Structure formats: C-alpha cells, structure tokens
Amino acid sequence: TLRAAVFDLDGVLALPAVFGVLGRTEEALALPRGLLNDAFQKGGPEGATTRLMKGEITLSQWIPLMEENCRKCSETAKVCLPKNFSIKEIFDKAISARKINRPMLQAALMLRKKGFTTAILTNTWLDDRAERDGLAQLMCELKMHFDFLIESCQVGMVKPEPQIYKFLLDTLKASPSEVVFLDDIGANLKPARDLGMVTILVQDTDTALKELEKVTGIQLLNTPAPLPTSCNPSDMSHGYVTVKPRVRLHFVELGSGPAVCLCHGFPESWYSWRYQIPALAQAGYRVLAMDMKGYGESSAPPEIEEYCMEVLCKEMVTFLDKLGLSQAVFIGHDWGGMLVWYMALFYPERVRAVASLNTPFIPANPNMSPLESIKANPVFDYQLYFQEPGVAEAELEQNLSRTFKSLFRASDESVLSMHKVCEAGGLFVNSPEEPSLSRMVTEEEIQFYVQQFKKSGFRGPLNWYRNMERNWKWACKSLGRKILIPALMVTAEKDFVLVPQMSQHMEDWIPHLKRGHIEDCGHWTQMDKPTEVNQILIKWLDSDAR
Amino acid sequence: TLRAAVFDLDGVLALPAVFGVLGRTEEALALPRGLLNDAFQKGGPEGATTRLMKGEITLSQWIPLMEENCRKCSETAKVCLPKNFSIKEIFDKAISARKINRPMLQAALMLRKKGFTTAILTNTWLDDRAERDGLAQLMCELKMHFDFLIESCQVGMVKPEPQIYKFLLDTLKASPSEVVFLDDIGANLKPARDLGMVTILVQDTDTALKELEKVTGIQLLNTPAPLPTSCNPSDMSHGYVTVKPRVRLHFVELGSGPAVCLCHGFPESWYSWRYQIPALAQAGYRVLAMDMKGYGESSAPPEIEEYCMEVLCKEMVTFLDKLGLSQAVFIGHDWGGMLVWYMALFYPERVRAVASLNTPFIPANPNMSPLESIKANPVFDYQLYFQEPGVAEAELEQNLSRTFKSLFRASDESVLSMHKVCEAGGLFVNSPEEPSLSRMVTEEEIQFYVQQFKKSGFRGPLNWYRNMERNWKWACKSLGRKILIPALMVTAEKDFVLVPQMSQHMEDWIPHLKRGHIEDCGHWTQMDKPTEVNQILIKWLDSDAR
C-alpha cells in the first residue's frame, strides 16, 4: 500500500542538524538555555527566519537580522553576549560540519530500488556566503538519488504550513495514506499526520530505521553493503572531438578538477567504467571515459595500421590538444593499459600520472619477434587466432548476445578455454549456445554492449592485435628510458591471461612504482570488484596525482 | 618563390635560450668561462646530450650524466664547483624563465596568413621532471599556430645531422630554395644552406625580422596589432547533454580550471564567443560556450512557455548537475546576460561569479506590466513587433544572408532604424536587399550563422521575447533580495538599445558590483572589440572568480 517516502534534509539525511548547533553554542558560551533558539524563531511567520526559508531574502541578508534578534533576546534575559560573538562564524561551522547520514541515504536508495518514489522536502535558504560551494556539493550528491527535491526557498512555502504538504502530494501524484514522512521536528509531522500520512519522528537513526522497516515490510537495517552508484548512459554529457579527418573520438564526461582519462580494453566500451565514473568525480576529479578508436561512437576505420600503438598514442595527444588540456592522468585496463604505459614512455610531459589495471609494462625484446613470444605461452593462443582478418570477426559477430554473455564472467563462472583455440577451430566451439547470465552483470548491461557492437562490429577492436611487429619496432626506441613519473600497477589475482606474476620485474623500469592487488578478482576488474578498484584509485590519486 | 618558413624553438620562438643560461651561471658562480658549455657538449654524437636530444634517455636520466660531465671538466680546469651546485636547479630555473618571443610568433602568424607553410624544427628532450607541465603548456600554446612541429626526441635525429633537413623537406613537400630557415645557432644553419635554403642567423629579434621582411617581401615589423586567435568550429570538442526528455543542450568546450559558462544573446550562437574562447582557456579556465535553447545544435521546441526565464534557469541548473559541476562562473550578453542575473538571484550556490555584457540588471516593477514599460521607450518598438507568432519569423527567415548582414554591423555602419518598426511594417522595410559586408565580420563568419539558423529557424529564438508577463511574475519573487556574490557589469558606449545609462542604479541591488566600459563599441560587443572584452574579463576572473 505504501509507495512513497519523503525525507527531511537537516537532522534526517544530513547530521548534525544545523538547528542543534544553537543548543551546543549556548552550552559552550555559557549563555542562558534556549537564548539562540528564541532569537532564531523571533517573530514567527512574520520573522526574519520565515522570510529566509520562503526565499524572500538570502542567507547573507538574514545574518545581521539574526544578530539584532540575539541582542533583543539578551536584553530581556538580563545577560550579555561575548565580545567575539558572530552569527556568521557559528553558521559557517555548523553548515561545514553537516555530513550525509549514510545509513539513512542507504535506506532511501533501497526503498527506491524496491519501487518507491523518494523525495526530499526541506526548509532551506538561498545561500550566497563565500563558502556556499560546500552546500552546493552536498545538494548535488544527494539530489541524484531522489526523484524529487522540494526546497522551501524555491516554492515560497515552509513547513509546517499545510499548503506545502498539499503541494508535496500533488508533485508525488499520491494520496496521503500511500506516503511515509520522516522528520526530526515534531511540529512538522503534525500536518502530515492530519492528512493521513504515516509519520516517523527521527530522534536517532537506528530507531527511525526500525520503524521504517516495520511500516514498509522491507529490510533496511543489517542489509549487505550496496554496489557503488552506476551511470545511466542517457544522463551523461557526451563529447566528440575530431582528431584527424576520418577519426572522431567519443567520450563521456563528469566532474571538475584534474583531468582523468579512462582507457578501456578489448572488447569493451566507456561503459566498462560505469562504477568508477561517479566515484572519481565525487572524489574531486574531472573524468573523461573514452570509447577507444574502433569502438562504440568513436570512428572505426578498417585499415589495420590505423590501430598500431604509435598512431593511437599520437591521436590521444591530439585529443588533449583539441580539448586544451596540457596534462591528464591516464588510467587503462587491458589494451588501454598497454596504451597508457606507452603514453608515459613517449609523451611524459602530457601525463600527470599513469595507472594500469591487470596489464603489466613489459619491455620489447630486440632479439625476439613478439609473434614468437606469444607462441611460447599457451594462454595467449587466442591472439594467434585473432591474426587472420575476417576469421575471429565472423565468430564474434555471429551472435552478439552469446559473445558478451560468454566473455563477461567471474573467475569461477568461466565457460571458455583460452588455450588450444586455434586447434579447436574457434573460441566458442565447446561453449553453450545459451550461456547463463553471470552474477557480475545484468541483462540490461549486456544489451548496452550488444547495441554498441551492432554499429561497427569487431574489425576495429581486433585490429589492435594485428600490429605486433609495428608495435615491437616502435617500442624498441624506448629501451633506454625509465618511467619516472607517478605510476600505479593494480594486479588481479584470478586473471589467468594477465597473471600478477607477469608484473614482478616492473620495478627495474619504474623504480618508484606503487602497487595494488585485488583478491578473488578476474580479468574484468572494474565490474568484478568495483568498490575495491575505486578505493585503490582514489587513494592513489589523492596522494600521487594531486 | 618562397613558400615555407621554419623556426627553431629555443633562442628563436622562446627567449631566453636555455643554452644561454649556462654562460650566465658561469659568470654568477665565478666558474671558468665555457666550463658548463663544455660539460653540456661532452662526448659529441656519442655524448649524454646527443642521447637526450635523440630521445634515447629522458631529462631526469640525463641530469646525473651532466653532473658527472661538470665534475670531469672541473678536474682538467683545476677548479672546484660550489657546495650548493645543482644541474636540476639550474635547468628548472632556465626552463621556467623561457617565454614566447611575441614579435617572432606574430611574424610566423603573419606569414601563415599570407599562404606560407610554417613549422618548428627543434632539438628538444622528453621532459619527465615534476615541473614538466610548464613546458607542456608552452608547447600547446605554440603548436596551434604552426602547420608542423618536428621534435628531435620524437624523430630520433638531431640538428645538425643532414638527415633531419632531408626529413624536414619531405614533410614540407617543398624544395630547398622555397624554404626560409631561422636558427640562433650557426652550426645548425650550415646544412640548410648546403641544400640551398635561405638561412637567417637570429642574434637579435629585430635584425632577424628585418632580414625576413627583405627576403619574403612581406611587412612584419611595425605592422598593426593582430586580432585575438579565433575558433575553427571543426577543431572544437562538441558536448551534448539531455536536460529533459525533449531538450538537449549543445556546447563547445576548451581548457582546464574553474568552469566558465558563456551565454549568447539574440540572434546568435556559441560562435559569437569565438575570440574569447581561446583567450579564456589560455588564461587558465575551462570554457563552456553554449548554444542556448532554441539555437544551433540545442533543442528548439515550438512552445512559447518553453522559453520563459524560470524554465531556462532550471535547465541551466540541470545542465551543471549532469556535468557534475557544483558551480560555474556565468558570463552572458544580451538575452544571455538577462539569464545570468536571474541565475545569481535564484541559484547563488551554483554561481561562482556573474558577468553581463551590455545587459543591465533591472528589477521588476510590481505596479507596472513589462509590456507597458516597453511602449514607454521608442527604441524597444522592435520587441512589440516580435510578439505576434509567425510575423517576425517570416521576415527574418526570408533571406538569412540578408538578415545577418543587416544585423551584425558596427555602430557607424547601421542600416536599420530600431524605432517605428511596427508602423513601417517590418525590420528591413527601408533596408537594402544586398547590404555591404561589415568590417566586423568576414563572409565565412556570416555563413556559419546562416548554416546554424537553416536548422531550426527563428521560432525558438523569438520565443525568448514572448514570455514578458510570466518573467515579470517570476522576478517579482526576488524583489527583497540583493546580489551579494562577485559581479561584473560591462557597458558598451554605442549600444543604442542597451545604453550604458540603463545600468546606473545597479549598485542599489549589487552593492559590491565591479564595472567595465568599452568606448566606440556597439551592441555586438564580442566581435566589435574582442581584445578589450578579453582583457576586462580575464582581469576580473583572476581577481574575483578565483
């Protein structure tokens, strides 16, 4: 029967309540009990604070009116306010201390996942202080998780006026008995309850959550840790840059701060970074997640030599030039990781810092052809199969749904033997026609990749493997160099192709290399262990790339 | 006969020459004359410096090799190096001090405008120092002005080896007698001259420029100040954000640093900021130049109410939310300027700073309808003409070339009377069918706007004028507020519609308002006086929006 949940911001979604700092300021400054709370409510509906909450005046205009109220209240109480008494200082510290109440936000996110319509209904102000960015950042993090945000200063109404509850019901398209309303101020619940809404008085979070569980029949407390926030492709800013007449690169962009370029592997997309993009932007970075050349909405020319590392790296430099970025942090995975090590070796001035997931830096051997080194390792047999143009394309393009369902699996769900691929005659020869869905991905996520590969097929992506000799000759020019800029290597325990053991001599070439290791993680690092990848990247970015 | 000009970077396009700091370091540290220059060239083609210039090793690997060379040279000279002697400190200070030689860059830009192919051919290194960004920024500013940039460390060859000159001629597709070559090092000219190229030894800039003038027949010295760098639309990064199901906003993006959002007026485009975009990005800002709703590649729904200020401002807030920007500096002109004042009044937390070109902030009068205020001023008569849907569209869409040629004119070139528009029956009734081209714009620039307005016509743009009453009712909610965030008002002397006198009472509402004034400037501020607009905005951004 319940289908909507409304939360207050102050004292419910964000703690501590700014209204609660008045009480602690009185105790600390030895002022009479309730003095600051009386100055705050001085005048009722015609008072300065109601004008502030309705949007009539801004926070900076209200501050000197609250100071007059503090002096008028002190005169009647026969007391004096300290010499260094400042409403501005008190409110700046209170607003700054207020952080998201993670268990409450998690309960709102869980209710929304179970079909509920969620909203924030709050009494708030137009913040024009020099420190207003701190509040703006808080509202941005919260608003993306709610269907509606109704702020008093924008609608010209305040709680507890009954018109704001009528406006709320109209916005929700719901009747009062279908709505749960959470607030920490008793007076604000009274009108919601007169209409017939379920009300919860929030004193402590745990008791409020227990009441919320009992009334919704959904478990909110003691539940498992949720996955990080993912991207909705239709909500992203899409960017397009022409790097050369026939080549245009597509990317998705989120955040402000130092530029971080994400480079996916084979056969993937910018969408393989869906769990890292919101996390990295929230950490204070401007994230650019590319569709590499040959993929998705980026150009996919047919010529093999359009995908050799020298051309790919030069186009990435042109990409930074056209965007007006002197530097970017480069983070790659699989083929993208191979590219980011070569960006650091050939264009160090354009690379702020470099990180690779799974892909180690392996220097070229001038005495041995790379095609002969691939034969020496039986797990790289699928790369010999990828050499002849047209062969692997026909198999991989035959059934796109089967291709992605067979590839994107956790280490214990594997359905492909990566060795004896050539001898067997294919990649999917001993594979089921209808593979089960992996616990790592949803059907909707698989369909995104299917839609992307319907456009240009596998020719461009497979050409990344068909320049072994050209790449070898190019890399041989860098054998005398070392990587002396900040660098991170992240290994994945259960990647049976790019094994952690293949990275063990990297310190000889990158002496100050930092490391990360992920246990129980397969090849598809980003979607296998997203919380762990995020934590490793954010910690390294904050210390070495800033 | 001459058709190509090649310049060296160090000592020619950038001064002072890093190679010249060795001489001044010797004089300051009382070291024997030429000691540091001998350590620098120690070994010839097999020496550390040649390996550095060929790209074999990076700058950080070369530093300890140059220190050994400094000690070996001091042993033979029977002298001692000071206690705090550091090659790293000497090179960091030398690279940092090197700035663009503006008269030389201006001469290269002039030669390129006259049909010459220009190139930089330089002996340079792979910079991996922690301070490498400074060099990266320098190379980015320079490379956009040249057809080719050939760096020794990328091609594996150095000057004076004859193969680098052969490689240069092949890249230029020119024979030696068609090439002018400028270098400050005599030894580097010798191979160019043996091939038959015209060579200029650069000791001082003025004498080199006089020699260059005599040999090309083009005046380079004493010439007028050139216009700021403009945008080539096909070289920009284009971004697209869906703010609501039927509405997608297009923007162009350049630079890194604090976000600056540019909002054009009627009937314009993101292209009206072509002279500000490279200047603002070079100053250290991330520039987002919008196609406002109804224009160019942004959505243009037909409904009138889709263009009222309340909807337009809310969509600009959603635009920041989808890009992950908590704040942006908002700069507007004409209708865009009207929008940026309302963004500051209703969403101050999202606005870092606000600037308007020509458009003053005029508060709503609750006693007077805005339609009656427009009749009181005869110069706003064209706005009454714009009220009836379909009428102004038919006239403005009839001949697009004529429409833009008649509108985009300097103050002394006007061909339209803005009063008695309704009585005359149109805007172009007493206007020439084939107006002359204004000195402000080229034919190519006019054609860009023609192409943009061929897509959605004038309905969307004209709807910005058809919400007078709705905007008035909305603005009346903000009559009790003041603008207390950083603000700039720039007036244009010869704007006969948005006269500077209309801004005189703005200090009552924006007490800390900063001002700018442009003499001999008409309505089309950005393209009329681009150098002056840039200087005013950059100075204000550096002091108030950072």
Ligand SMILES: CN(CCO)c1ccc(Br)cn1
């Ligand atoms: C990134 N990979 C594994 C592709 O499946 C890679 C990179 C370089 C070479 Br050589 C071989 N494999």
Ligand SMILES: CN(CCO)c1ccc(Br)cn1
């Ligand atoms: C690179 N590929 C696709 C080969 O068809 C790959 C890599 C790791 C794992 Br596990 C599976 N496939």
Ligand SMILES: CN(CCO)c1ccc(Br)cn1
């Ligand atoms: C920006 N302008 C001039 C348009 O030509 C403007 C703005 C608001 C009102 Br009301 C009238 N004109």
Ligand SMILES: CN(CCO)c1ccc(Br)cn1
């Ligand atoms: C806003 N317009 C277009 C009216 O057709 C305008 C503004 C200033 C000058 Br000058 C000319 N036109």
